[PDB]
Design an enzyme around this catalytic site. Structure first.
Site, PDB file in Angstrom:
ATOM      1  N   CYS A 196      43.529  34.568  40.613  1.00 18.43           N
ATOM      2  CA  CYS A 196      44.035  33.248  40.279  1.00 18.43           C
ATOM      3  C   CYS A 196      44.318  33.252  38.797  1.00 18.43           C
ATOM      4  O   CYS A 196      43.686  34.009  38.047  1.00 18.43           O
ATOM      5  CB  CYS A 196      43.041  32.144  40.634  1.00 18.43           C
TER       6      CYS A 196
ATOM      7  N   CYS B  66      47.564  31.157  42.809  1.00 21.36           N
ATOM      8  CA  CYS B  66      46.461  30.211  42.671  1.00 21.36           C
ATOM      9  C   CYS B  66      46.039  29.957  41.251  1.00 21.36           C
ATOM     10  O   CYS B  66      46.104  30.832  40.369  1.00 21.36           O
ATOM     11  CB  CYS B  66      45.191  30.586  43.480  1.00 21.36           C
TER      12      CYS B  66
END
Length: 232
Positions: A71, A152
């Protein structure tokens, strides 16, 4: 056709690139079978009309070559892809589509089969303008969409400030990637408008095109920030 012919020795090239990737580039995927992957890739297009491609043709290849990047590390270079080269020192953590396993082996290659043929087509391949449903375009389009869906945390897109309308809705990032970002995984999009130093910028964070983008993210309930940076 107008598009480039299938890259010579294609099958060998994706296999080598695949092995290098799971050995040297990202040993964490040393588990994958680069051979199954090579074969999944060829089966997808080989011996089929080169204008009949559908995303469902890549189902297996997409399953075999799955990957989720860390992420906060997903990046996009919009109309700024050649430009990525000056920022490379700054980019060592970040992942572009080209940096994924599938993006890495398919990078700069071309491929198309033909009806009645067990072999790639070296002469030519239909390009996007010949027919949008060609196998190379269906692949890149589908890879990008997936890359953005798996993105993400924080995401960033590098834009060009030396051009009017740095944010382009006809760019694959503006037409496809931003829309495939998910509010449930991505909390903010950070946009960088890069300027070459000492020249009046043709587009800014304050500009109309960047406001256009901000409106897209606003609609998906995703925060947007914009910063201007003189390239290093």
């Amino acid at each position: 056709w107008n598009g480039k012919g299938s890259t010579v020795d294609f099958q060998e090239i994706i296999l080598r690139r695949c092995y290098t990737y799971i050995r040297v580039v990202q040993p964490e995927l040393g588990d994958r079978d680069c051979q199954k992957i090579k074969k999944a890739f060829t089966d997808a297009f080989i011996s089929k009309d080169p204008c009949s491609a559908r995303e469902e043709d890549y189902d297996l290849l997409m399953k075999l070559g799955h990957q989720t990047v860390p992420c906060d590390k997903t990046v996009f270079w919009s109309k700024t892809k050649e430009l990525a080269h000056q920022y490379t020192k700054t980019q060592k953590g970040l992942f572009t589509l080209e940096n994924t396993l599938l993006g890495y082996i398919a990078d700069d290659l071309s491929w198309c089969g033909k009806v009645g043929s067990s072999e790639i087509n070296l002469e030519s391949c239909p390009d996007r303008r010949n027919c949008n449903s060609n196998f190379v375009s269906v692949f890149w389009n589908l890879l990008s969409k997936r890359f953005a869906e798996n993105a993400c945390g924080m995401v960033q897109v590098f834009l060009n400030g030396s051009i009017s309308n740095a944010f382009d809705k006809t760019s694959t990032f503006g037409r496809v990637e931003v829309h495939s970002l998910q509010p449930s995984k991505v909390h903010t999009l950070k946009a960088w408008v890069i300027h070459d130093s000492g020249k009046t910028p043709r587009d800014t964070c304050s500009g109309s095109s960047i406001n256009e983008l901000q409106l897209i993210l606003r609609g998906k309930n995703i925060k947007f920030t914009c910063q201007e940076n003189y390239r290093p």
